[PDB]
Amino acid sequence: QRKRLAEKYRECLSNKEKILKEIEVKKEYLSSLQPRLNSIMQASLPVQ
């Protein structure tokens, strides 16, 4: 039972690490899409 509780705690820690990785991926995606939208607007303004 202690080994099963340790395995459940390791699975919960892996789920928390996956949630933190998803939050970091969302933050990096927003930080990259900010300059990407800036470059897309700068490219659209020359075509406009």
Binding site: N38, M41, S44, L45
Partner: peptide
């Protein structure tokens, strides 16, 4: 007059898009 209204609507849409891009550049 219809073609001029469509061109003015396209120009106002382009100006609104430029203003939104300027607001996004000012916020970021």
């Amino acid at each position: 007059e219809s073609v001029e209204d469509k061109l003015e609507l396209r120009r106002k849409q382009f100006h609104v898009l430029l203003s939104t891009i300027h607001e996004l550049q000012q916020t970021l």
